[PDB]
């Protein structure tokens, strides 16, 4: 149905995302159990890690477009990523390595992420009808890799240890690299302009030098979240000042702030909703016992099923508004499940969390899956940089918000933790409902501005 290079890119993306989500699914628990962090420290350190992972994406797009070539930067990114996963596995012998190892994942993701999508865009003549379907299948590729990793990585880590889990993340990257290398001939006439000139070793060293520097900076920021906060705060207020000094751009800005709220809520899945599943949900569904950390896989699960349906099936501000209403309902459902539908021992049915994740995934499909696609319709590279930047700010804020659910390690009674989760999730859901209402009210004004 699709060009041959589509299938190469599909599977490269699948395996790279498998490696990444293998880490994301187990990282907060790894911080708590393996490194002895409090739940509060674990949550904010996860926020900083994710913030760097997402905030650096603009660098790799620049590197791919203008320094080394899209295809070269795919190879380089995959290699730095694989190295990062094996370094994380090595952190079990050398615990002092962990932040450097995570910094290497962040910088690697920063180099890699923009470039397969760029490549995929170039696999189709410019007005090919198959393009939309191709990007929906690319999103599904991301979520199949995510579904497999989030399902299996906690089970593997429990049965064989973190070293094996992380080494398997590396192996997933190695298999992305092998499928690219084996299919390289399929993209011989596809790439950015530097891809077709011989590689500049000057620029390659500038990129390796800058990457190593960034790996150390990322490690430091993750160890000292209290200045990661200030860095992103001053960077944000500054880009706010320089955006405000400098009206179809106002629609992109307001859509960026609503997306920020969405990413704050997404950040709860690997942190507070993860520990809510651990502490106050039954770990058995349809008669099968499961690792409760695996419940995170319900996000890609619902995405994989719903993207075709919603691909088959107002306009700008209203789709965003709908997504925010869905997200509000996800957290109001979590709160209600804890408030009214818990056991005498404090445990709730996992069907409530299946529904929580349905709501959150629908919110995702309306807001972020379909965000920068028509942020490109209102606008460029600068707004791409700020988009990923504000997503980083959102992850830092999300870690901070998750800390309101942190439970001390000596608590053992689910009836003590349940009201904490229900209070915080109820307030998240009510605040997000208010945001969704203000969004609805601004929809007519926004929809005129787009005219």
């Amino acid at each position: 149905q699709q060009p041959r290079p589509f299938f190469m890119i599909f599977f490269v993306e699948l395996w790279e995302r498998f490696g990444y989500y293998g880490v994301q699914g187990v990282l907060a628990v790894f911080f708590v159990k393996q490194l002895g962090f409090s739940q509060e420290q674990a949550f904010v350190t996860f926020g900083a890690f994710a913030a760097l992972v997402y905030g650096l994406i603009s660098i790799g797009g620049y590197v791919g477009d203008h320094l080394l070539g899209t295809k070269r930067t795919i190879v380089l990114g995959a290699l730095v990523l694989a190295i990062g996963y094996f370094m994380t596995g090595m952190s079990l012998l050398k615990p002092d390595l962990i932040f450097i190892a995570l910094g290497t994942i962040a910088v690697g993701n920063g180099l890699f992420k923009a470039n397969p999508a760029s490549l995929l865009s170039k696999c189709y003549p410019p007005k090919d009808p198959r393009l939309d379907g191709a990007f929906t299948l690319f999103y599904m590729s991301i979520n199949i890799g995510s579904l497999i990793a989030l399902s299996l990585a906690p089970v593997i880590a429990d049965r064989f240890g973190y070293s094996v889990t992380y080494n398997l993340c590396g192996a997933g990257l190695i298999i992305a690299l092998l499928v690219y290398i084996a299919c390289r001939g399929m993209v011989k006439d596809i790439g950015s302009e530097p891809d077709f000139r011989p590689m500049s070793f000057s620029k390659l060293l500038y990129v390796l030098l800058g990457s190593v520097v960034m790996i150390f900076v990322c490690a430091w920021l993750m160890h000292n979240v209290e200045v990661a906060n200030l860095v992103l705060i001053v960077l944000s207020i500054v880009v706010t000042i320089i955006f405000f000094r400098q009206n179809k751009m106002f629609v992109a800005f307001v859509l960026m702030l609503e997306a920020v709220v969405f990413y704050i809520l997404y950040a709860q899945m690997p942190t507070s909703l993860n520990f809510f599943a651990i502490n106050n949900v039954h770990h058995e569904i349809l008669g099968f016992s499961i690792n409760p950390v695996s419940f995170q896989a319900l996000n890609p699960f619902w995405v994989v099923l719903a993207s075709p349906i919603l691909a088959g099936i107002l306009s700008m501000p209203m789709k965003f508004t709908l997504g925010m209403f869905m997200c509000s309902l996800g957290f109001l459902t979590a709160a209600a499940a804890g408030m009214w539908f818990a056991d005498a021992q404090g445990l709730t049915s996992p069907w409530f969390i299946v529904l929580v994740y349905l709501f959150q995934s629908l919110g995702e499909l309306f807001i972020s899956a379909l965000g920068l696609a028509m942020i490109a319709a209102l606008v460029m590279g600068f707004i791409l940089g700020m988009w990923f930047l504000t997503q980083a700010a959102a992850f830092l804020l999300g870690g901070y918000v998750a800390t309101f659910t942190a439970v001390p390690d000596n608590i053992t009674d689910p009836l003590e933790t349940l009201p904490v989760y229900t209070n915080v999730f109820g307030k998240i859901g009510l605040v997000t409902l208010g945001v969704a209402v203000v969004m609805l009210l601004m929809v007519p004004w926004l929809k005129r501005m787009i005219a």
Partner: nanobody
Amino acid sequence: VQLVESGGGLVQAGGSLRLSCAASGPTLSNYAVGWFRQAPGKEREFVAGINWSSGLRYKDVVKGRFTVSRDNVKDTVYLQMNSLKPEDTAVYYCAARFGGMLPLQPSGYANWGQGTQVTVSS
């Protein structure tokens, strides 16, 4: 996923016994282990437990006599039972739930040992 209990038996009032719980494939380190007991003609009841991070919970009538502890090197959980009394006679079970919580009812736990008879004679 499968727990083996060991160390039950027959003892006189005031005596002592140590139960141990070991797991097969998974590392018990990620699991809260609760000890339940079922006396003749009654339901399983929570007796004592330790979560994945050294939190402890106890039934009131065994405080000051029972101690739960964990050796994370040998991947083993122990119930040390001192000052035993006839009414501690029961089949004892270890049960395991992932994480930091020790719920009071058997349904909070997915993984179960087979049970060890403890008898305390007057």
